[PDB]
Every structure is written in structure tokens, then in C-alpha cells.
Amino acid sequence: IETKVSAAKITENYQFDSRIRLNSIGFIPNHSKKATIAANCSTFYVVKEDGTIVYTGTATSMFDNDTKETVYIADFSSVNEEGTYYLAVPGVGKSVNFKIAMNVYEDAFKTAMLGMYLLRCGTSVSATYNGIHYSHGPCHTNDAYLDYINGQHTKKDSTKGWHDAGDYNKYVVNAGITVGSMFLAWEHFKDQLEPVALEIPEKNNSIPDFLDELKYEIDWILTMQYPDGSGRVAHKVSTRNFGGFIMPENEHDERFFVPWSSAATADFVAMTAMAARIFRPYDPQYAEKCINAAKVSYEFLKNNPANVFANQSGFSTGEYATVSDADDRLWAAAEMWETLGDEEYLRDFENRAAQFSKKIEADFDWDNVANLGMFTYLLSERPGKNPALVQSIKDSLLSTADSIVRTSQNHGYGRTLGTTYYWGCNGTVVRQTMILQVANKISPNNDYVNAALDAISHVFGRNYYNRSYVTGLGINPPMNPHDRRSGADGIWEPWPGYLVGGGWPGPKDWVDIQDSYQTNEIAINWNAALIYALAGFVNYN
Ligand SMILES: [Ca+2]
Ligand SMILES: [Ca+2]
Ligand SMILES: [Ca+2]
Ligand SMILES: [Zn+2]
Numbered sequence: 325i326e327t328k329v330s331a332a333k334i335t336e337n338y339q340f341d342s343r344i345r346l347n348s349i350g351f352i353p354n355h356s357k358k359a360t361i362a363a364n365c366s367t368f369y370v371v372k373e374d375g376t377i378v379y380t381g382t383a384t385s386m387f388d389n390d391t392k393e394t395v396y397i398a399d400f401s402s403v404n405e406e407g408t409y410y411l412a413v414p415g416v417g418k419s420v421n422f423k424i425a426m427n428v429y430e431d432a433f434k435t436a437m438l439g440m441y442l443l444r445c446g447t448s449v450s451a452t453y454n455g456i457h458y459s460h461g462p463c464h465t466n467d468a469y470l471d472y473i474n475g476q477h478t479k480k481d482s483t484k485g486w487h488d489a490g491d492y493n494k495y496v497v498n499a500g501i502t503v504g505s506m507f508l509a510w511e512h513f514k515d516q517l518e519p520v521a522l523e524i525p526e527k528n529n530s531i532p533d534f535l536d537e538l539k540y541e542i543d544w545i546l547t548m549q550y551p552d553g554s555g556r557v558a559h560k561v562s563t564r565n566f567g568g569f570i571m572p573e574n575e576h577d578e579r580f581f582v583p584w585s586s587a588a589t590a591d592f593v594a595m596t597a598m599a600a601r602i603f604r605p606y607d608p609q610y611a612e613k614c615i616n617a618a619k620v621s622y623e624f625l626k627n628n629p630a631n632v633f634a635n636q637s638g639f640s641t642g643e644y645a646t647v648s649d650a651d652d653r654l655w656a657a658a659e660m661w662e663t664l665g666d667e668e669y670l671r672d673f674e675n676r677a678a679q680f681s682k683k684i685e686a687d688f689d690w691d692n693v694a695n696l697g698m699f700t701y702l703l704s705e706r707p708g709k710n711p712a713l714v715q716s717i718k719d720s721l722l723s724t725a726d727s728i729v730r731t732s733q734n735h736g737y738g739r740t741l742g743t744t745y746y747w748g749c750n751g752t753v754v755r756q757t758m759i760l761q762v763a764n765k766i767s768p769n770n771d772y773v774n775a776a777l778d779a780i781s782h783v784f785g786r787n788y789y790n791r792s793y794v795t796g797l798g799i800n801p802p803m804n805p806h807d808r809r810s811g812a813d814g815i816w817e818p819w820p821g822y823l824v825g826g827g828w829p830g831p832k833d834w835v836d837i838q839d840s841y842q843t844n845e846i847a848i849n850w851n852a853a854l855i856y857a858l859a860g861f862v863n864y865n
Pocket of ligand 4: 444445446447463464487492572
């Protein structure tokens with residue numbers, strides 16, 4: 325007997341069907357919620373796990389130019405009541421269960437941060453995730469020799485930091501966009517991130533956990549300044565060739581400092597200038613050490629304007645040879661100015677900024693970090709900015725954010741990067757949230773926040789594969805990443821919390837096999853983009 329308050333309940337029993345693709349983690353109340361159904365259909369129900377039909381709708385068809393298929397879009401954004409639901413599509417089947425909650429992304433954020441902790445070098449790491457224990461002993465404790473720097477086969481401490489990707493070498497240019505992304509997440513969402521506790525050794529000190537993780541990397545970056553006091557910064561610490569699939573503590577080859585590059589030197593300045601202002605409130609002494617190092621390398625750069633590529637002929641590991649250091653130098657000037665305030669730094673930034681035709685780029689990564697410099701300058705509360713330059717950057721930013729909104733709204737799976745695929749493009753999909761969040765800070769628009777959620781949803785299930793691209797999370801995540809710890813331990817499931825690079829050159833080119841470093845590797849710059857994307861939705865209201 326049904327009363328006047330009994331709610332409608334699903335009649336038939338549905339089976340999971342891979343053609344119903346959506347964010348496998350969940351949605352936030354008051355934001356878009358969409359699913360892409362790769363099957364002909366019309367009616368769909370959003371059902372609570374108890375069988376209660378909460379919403380009935382009809383899917384609308386749309387041609388996915390990317391995969392060249394007609395797909396059906398189920399929009400259930402109106403459902404805003406917290407709970408666990410699933411999508412039931414008569415004739416197709418049902419989706420995985422997902423949650424609608426204000427804090428739906430917090431575990432994902434903590435897991436992506438756990439990913440960074442597990443990438444630590446020079447120390448033993450240990451974590452239990454979903455009941456499986458991941459750990460490894462102290463590794464690369466003898467970094468690194470000066471042979472290629474000065475000639476002496478002597479050791480200068482260069483331990484700590486994070487292994488870069490599937491390999492264990494540490495590269496400065498890639499640490500640039502990584503550290504920059506994560507420090508910008510802290511500056512943009514400080515109030516949301518400060519109280520977050522992570523599973524790290526430093527959980528019991530006086531520094532916000534998010535910053536302890538970044539400190540592990542900055543501690544390493546500081547050791548990269550040449551020992552001659554010239555201010556030049558070594559490009560990377562690396563073995564001569566890529567080692568094999570072994571645990572890091574078993575890699576005994578000697579690691580060397582590789583000759584400097586101007587880009588690495590400019591990135592060093594930007595990273596340590598940011599660290600100086602961000603750590604000052606917590607460890608003033610550490611901040612002083614950072615700003616002094618930044619000043620030495622900046623003086624060098626100021627006197628040697630040429631773009632210089634690192635001499636790394638004897639090495640066969642990652643190159644990270646950014647074609648230009650103009651963007652890196654622009655970023656360094658913006659960070660020195662924001663931290664210090666001197667007119668000298670502001671003048672340097674503005675002179676370089678004017679030389680950029682398009683102030684903001686929708687597609688950016690380790691090679692083009694100008695956006696980071698534009699972001700710091702644009703949001704700075706310091707006086708003195710040339711109002712014409714500000715308006716120029718602002719227009720470019722909003723114009724770019726609008727383009728990304730239009731792209732995701734017209735993509736059959738809400739992909740912000742549209743039809744563009746290339747090595748590491750999954751990282752860029754979520755890195756685009758930086759543009760959207762900054763645009764939202766300058767000119768509030770919920771289209772910007774929803775597009776950011778589209779980028780996040782794309783990576784967690786609303787994609788052609790109906791798979792999460794992050795190990796240990798969501799639906800059918802990567803099982804075989806090109807990752808040495810994963811390929812060499814005795815555990816079935818790979819190490820958790822990593823966004824894989826992604827397929828290319830096409831939408832269906834991702835392959836989840838260990839040999840595919842082209843589409844299935846992990847990397848700090850990809851995880852940093854994911855961390856920034858999720859950060860804005862931690863302790864969110
Ligand atoms: Ca702490
Ligand atoms: Ca560059
Ligand atoms: Ca394994
Ligand atoms: Zn290591």
C-alpha cells in the first residue's frame with residue numbers, strides 16, 4: 325500500500341552498459357550533470373540506489389565530430405539532492421553508481437596528492453590505499469655527481485624531489501609547470517586548501533599539508549643551482565640512459581647534474597620566488613633562503629639574455645628542451661615582482677608581456693609557461709600595473725575562456741580540448757581549468773565553472789572509453805601504466821592517483837599497456853594539472 329508521500333520507484337531491473345558514459349565519481353549540487361549515451365535512446369531516469377525515480381528526461385542527439393558518431397546527451401543538472409544515484413536508460417541499460425554531494429571530489433583530490441607523495445625520491449615511501457600496501461625503500465640517495473658540470477667526479481647533494489614520470493630522473497623544466505600549477509592552486513584556493521590533511525609524514529607539523537608536499541620538491545630544486553655561485557641552474561639529475569623496470573631503491577647507477585639551460589634557470593627563479601612568498605608565513609627562514617637563491621639566478625639571467633639549450637649529448641633520458649625561454653623569463657619576472665614588489669621586476673615583466681601577440685593560450689604545458697606569468701600579474705593586488713596591458717591580458721583571458729566553454733558545450737563528451745590529441749593531452753584537458761577558474765575570478769560566470777567540471781568529468785568517465793584515466797579511481801581505471809614502480813613490484817594493481825598521458829593522435833588511440841609510454845605513462849605535470857582542477861572543488865560551497 326502506497327501512501328500520498330510514497331515516491332515513484334523503478335520497475336525493471338537494469339544491467340550495467342558501457343554505452344552510458346559519465347563522471348564515475350560524481351557531481352556537485354548546482355552544477356551541470358551530463359551523460360553521453362552511445363546508443364539510440366530517448367527516455368532516461370536518474371534513480372536513487374533504493375529504486376526511487378527522482379527525475380525523468382529525454383536524451384537529445386548530437387554528432388560527435390571527434391569520434392564521428394551520433395551520441396545522445398542526457399542532461400540531469402536539475403537533480404540537486406545529495407545521494408548515490410545511477411542513470412537508467414530503457415533499452416540500453418544503466419550507468420555505474422555515482423554520488424551527488426558538495427564534497428564529492430575530496431577523496432579524489434587526496435588520492436591525486438597521495439600520487440605525488442608516492443613519487444618522492446631520496447626517501448622511503450609507504451601508503452595503504454584500498455587495502456593494498458604500496459611502499460619502497462630509500463632511493464637515489466647518492467644524487468648527484470659534478471662530472472658534467474665542472475669535471476670533478478664529486479658528489480653535491482641533490483636528493484629529494486619527485487621522480488618525474490614512469491622514469492626516476494628529476495628534470496627542472498618539467499618541475500616548473502608542475503610547481504607553478506600547484507602553487508597557483510594554493511594561491512587561488514588557499515582557504516579551501518589550508519585545512520586539508522594528507523597522508524604524509526609531515527601531517528603533524530605546523531605547515532599546511534599541501535605545502536609540505538611542495539616543500540619536498542623545492543628542497544630539491546634549491547640544490548640545482550651551480551656550485552660556482554654563478555646563478556646558473558643544472559637542467560636535470562639523471563642516469564645516462566633510462567634504466568629498466570626495477571624498484572627505485574635498486575637503481576644503483578650514478579646520477580649526474582646535467583649542464584644548465586637558460587629555461588631551467590628562469591623556471592628556478594619563478595619557482596623559488598613563489599616559494600618565498602608562500603612559505604614566509606610558515607617558515608620565514610626557508611623563505612629567506614628561497615628569495616636569496618631566486619635573486620642570484622635572476623641577476624644572472626638579467627645579464628645573459630640569450631636562450632641557451634642544455635648540453636646533454638651524453639644523456640639519453642628526457643630532454644625537456646623547451647624551444648624558447650622567453651615565456652620562462654616572463655614568468656620569472658612576474659613572480660619576482662609579485663613577491664618583492666620592485667619596479668625593476670614589474671618593468672621587466674611588462675616589457676616582455678607586450679611582446680606576446682596572444683596573451684593567453686588555451687593549450688599550454690611545460691614548454692609554454694607564459695600563462696602562469698600572466699595569471700600572477702593579472703590577479704596581483706599590487707599597484708603600478710599598466711592599465712592598457714591589464715585590459716589586453718583580461719580580454720585575451722575571457723576570450724580564451726569563452727572559446728573553451730564553446731568547445732566543451734559542442735563536444736559530444738564535454739572535452740574542453742576539443743579534437744586535439746597529442747602526447748600528454750589528458751594533462752592539458754584538466755590544466756585548462758586554470759584558465760576557466762582565473763576567468764571566473766575576473767568575471768564570474770557559471771559557464772566557466774561548469775566547463776571546468778566538464779574537463780574533470782571527461783577524465784573520470786565521460787569519454788569514449790567509458791574509463792577513468794586516473795589509476796585507483798573511478799570506473800575501470802588504467803591497470804598497466806608505463807610506470808616502473810608498478811611494473812616492478814609484486815602487486816597486481818598499479819600505484820594509485822595518477823592521470824595517464826592519453827591517446828593520440830586520435831580519440832580512440834589510448835592503449836592501456838605497459839609498453840605504451842606514448843599514451844599510458846604518468847607524469848608530475850599531468851598530476852599537477854589534475855590537482856589544480858580538483859583543488860577548486862575541495863571544501864567547496
Ligand atoms: Ca603538515
Ligand atoms: Ca618555454
Ligand atoms: Ca604491479
Ligand atoms: Zn628516487
